[PDB]
Write a protein that binds this ligand. Sequence first.
Ligand code: HEC
Ligand code: HEC
Ligand code: HEM
Lengths: 185, 107, 218, 524
Amino acid sequence: LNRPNMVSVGTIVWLSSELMFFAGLFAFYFSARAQAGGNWPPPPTELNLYQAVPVTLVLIASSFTCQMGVFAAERGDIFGLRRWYVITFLMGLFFVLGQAYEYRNLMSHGTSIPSSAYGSVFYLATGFHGLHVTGGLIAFIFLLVRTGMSKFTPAQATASIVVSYYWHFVDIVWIALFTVIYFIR
Amino acid sequence: LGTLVAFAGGLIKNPWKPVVPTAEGKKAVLWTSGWTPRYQGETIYLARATGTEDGPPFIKMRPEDMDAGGMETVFPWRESDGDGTTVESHHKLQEIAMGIRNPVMLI
Amino acid sequence: SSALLRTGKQLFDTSCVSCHGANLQGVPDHGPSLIGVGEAAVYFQVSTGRMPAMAPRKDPIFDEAQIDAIGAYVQANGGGPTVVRNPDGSIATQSLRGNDLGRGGDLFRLNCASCHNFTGKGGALSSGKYAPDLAPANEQQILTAMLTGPQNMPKFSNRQLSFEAKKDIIAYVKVATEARQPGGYLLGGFGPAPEGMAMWIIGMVAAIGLALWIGARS
Amino acid sequence: LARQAEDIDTRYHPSAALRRQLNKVFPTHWSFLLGEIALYSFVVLLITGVYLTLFFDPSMVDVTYNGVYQPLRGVEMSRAYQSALDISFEVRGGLFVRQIHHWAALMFAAAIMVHLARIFFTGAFRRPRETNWVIGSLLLILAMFEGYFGYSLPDDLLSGLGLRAALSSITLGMPVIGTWLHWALFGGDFPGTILIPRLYALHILLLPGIILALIGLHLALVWFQKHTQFPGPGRTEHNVVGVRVMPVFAFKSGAFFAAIVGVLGLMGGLLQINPIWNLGPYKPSQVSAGSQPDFYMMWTEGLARIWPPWEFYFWHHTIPAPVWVAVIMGLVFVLLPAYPFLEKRFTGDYAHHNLLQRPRDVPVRTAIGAMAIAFYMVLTLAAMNDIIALKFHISLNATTWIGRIGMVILPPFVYFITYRWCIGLQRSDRSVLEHGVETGIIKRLPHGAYIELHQPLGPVDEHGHPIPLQYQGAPLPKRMNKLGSAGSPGSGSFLFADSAAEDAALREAGHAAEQRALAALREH
Ligand code: HEC
Ligand code: HEC
Ligand code: HEM
């Protein structure tokens, strides 16, 4: 019974709506970018390439570990699932501390939210991504707590899988944003 | 009854006895506010507060020193009080400062 | 200067003529005459974002030194209090700060604290308008606003209050708000009502959670 | 040690009474700990107050500060405020201790209010324990008055204004006696040289001692007369179900005391309370929006605020409005201990009861409780009008009118709503009694129907539909997971599983233990 899973399609359409939310955010950012000529970033701003790439590597490694957790998930093993999810949670927490440190460094040297338009749009674009990453960590915590309180059912596996490709979607949108910002400029 | 009456006798006071001297004899505290003249013709200035210790706590007030929407606080002066130099004058100034029914607005 | 002031006030018809008239006559329906107030009134009412509205604070409209032009225009039209300036061509910033604090604090608790607050936060008035918080206030605008007498605020003359009194008042205002509270997290500077709210929302919840954890339900 | 026990037994010969009390059994329920919290808070207040008394000086002679707080140097001020500033700033950790004291007092007030509410809801105020209810009412009134006297010793602008307004206006407003009481209390006019020492003495000596003695009396009464218990499987009106003292009861009490001290200390260290240094010394000429005193007598302030201005004028006399406020608060005081007599002479019930009733069973009492709590909440929130209009841009007059009209119109609405709510809860309980609890599973029934597949809770008829049960006033589960269906996952800790034999042994041992406990409770 129930050859497809309604949770799957529900999460798919929810991620679609969130993808359009990020579409709106990208629309805000790309607007007025061409309105400034030459050095369209303000000089009181210089992105640290030596610190942005490591967090991207962190996130892609976390996504790969999450996929390994999924592969453990479709079969009857909960403990490896918990181990992989804990590794992913720690990796994401390290990432979050990474952009927190970047945030502290950036405002300390001029540019702030009310300072320049470029700073405002960059801060707005990154803030929603950070909030969604924190929500994903909360989802990890809730799901891992739920696993150890009762028996194992296909519903638990479905929840794990939907959270997993929600995280994968987060990784994809983050790498797209990184390519937009640090490379195309 | 005798013991309880003796025990309760330490708190009873008359709120209607004349203790405060006035210009028409002596009146109870509740009927006075410190603005009552004391010898029928005293000159009392609407002195305003200053907040400084070296300078007098209250200084006299001139009509020109106001504005169309100015709010000020004044207190009775009683020139015989004097400025806050001697101990008696300072204590009298503090006494006139600590009065519930003393402060008056002038708008 | 004066011609540039006329350009920025009247020829910049976005600002002046729509409510007070080209000759600063003052249309009785909307606004006042605006003929006896000095440049200080304009400086305070413009630099603090209290710009024409449809009036809580907002972003300023004119900032690129044209506020000085507007002040010069209005002071030429009619006399009044003027902005206190630093002896170098700029506006005084720290020379206005005084030294005495006890007298300043006493004056604050005698005339300032009544509307604003004990600690300078927002205060509550009747029928709409209120008392704004003094946290976003800057000292020059503080002195100018006192000397100007804005809406619902008693106007204060330099004759009745000494200049040293203004220095002490602004010194106390800047000390009270900018100093770290030596009692941990602050709770808005109000009375014990937020304290009771915090007790009901935190102490009660944690206490009943610990009671449920320790106890059993049956 | 054996020798010490032998000597103690040979000297005082205590074994029997000690065995009697040590074998006492106490009921087990989370709602039964809402008095221990208040008692522990009381202990905290007592210890802190013992500490604070070593650095205070209650004198109203004017002095100069010349201490360490620069923005307050060279100002005429009361001695007591100087001592309070000394305790706050010039003693290592004194501010922490006084903040703990104030927070603990608020803890005490909230705990006593919650405990009274739970007692009123459970309906334990019947014939066997009416004097306990009267004593509790007296305790509440005395504690409220003591708390009012608490925040007034450091006579700042807030405390001075509050005490001035309340005491002076109410006492001077008395119709017949009036000025006599005020002059006796203050020794003349309002600002007296003896007021603060008298208040300090009353706050340290009389009220705390009376409160402690009455609390001991209440605890002794609840000790002798055995505690009630909720209805259950092995519960009856002639026995008490629970645990003994030695292995559980005292240990849980100590752990709860430690936890409550912990939360008090944490939240005291985190939250600033009553920053008197930010305030100023009390003077008659200084006043501002600073109002709304402590939140456990705030209802009196709200009642004073909302009351309409009615006055009477006859031959050279005048009765002001606040006399009505005094009448209302006196009637509220009177009604609190008189409620059980009214109930027992209204319903005509004179039967003993050792078993409580769940809140949804009795609609009328719950409706009256909702009446009272809604009235108290609307009165309390009315007094916070200024902050309402400040934080949220609302008209002050509009909010005052809203409170005034709501004090009359809201009570009947919530009364009717909670009556309907209780009736609906009873209906739902009857419905879940009639059929099996819903399992949340549907079946296709190839002929074309859909069924709930109720799980029966007991006997089943020949048709498969469980026979109706009877209501015994006992709670029943409304969710499948509440009863044992599928739980207790693998024996791993957080990352690594254990041996299968160990997990199976643990599972069977736990199931056997729970089944044995349930069988022993049900059969006996
Ligand atoms: C009607 C829209 C409107 C416009 C346009 C407007 N104001 Fe006002 N402002 C008011 C009104 C109305 C008042 C009267 C008092 C109040 O409402 O606070 C006022 C008050 C003032 C005050 C303080 C009160 C006083 O008597 O001086 C000053 C100064 C002032 N306006 C100057 C200006 C200046 C300078 C401009 C051009 C930048 C301007 N106004 C344009 C609305 C406006
Ligand atoms: C309730 C009567 C009242 C009194 C008393 C009063 N104020 Fe004001 N004041 C106001 C009102 C109302 C405003 C805001 C008006 C507006 O925003 O249009 C204001 C404005 C201010 C501002 C400007 C804040 C800002 O962000 O622009 C400061 C600073 C200030 N007051 C401080 C003081 C000082 C200093 C005193 C003592 C001289 C004082 N208040 C006494 C009514 C009062
Ligand atoms: C009976 C319950 C009590 C209540 C409701 C109560 C109420 C209060 C309150 C509200 C304060 C203000 C706290 C503060 O400002 O930080 C206070 C302070 C104080 N209380 Fe109590 N108190 C109680 C018991 C005691 C006891 C038993 C003592 C000791 C005899 C005591 C002595 C003090 C002292 C010395 C202070 C000064 C500390 C201060 O105000 O900062 N109190 N009390």
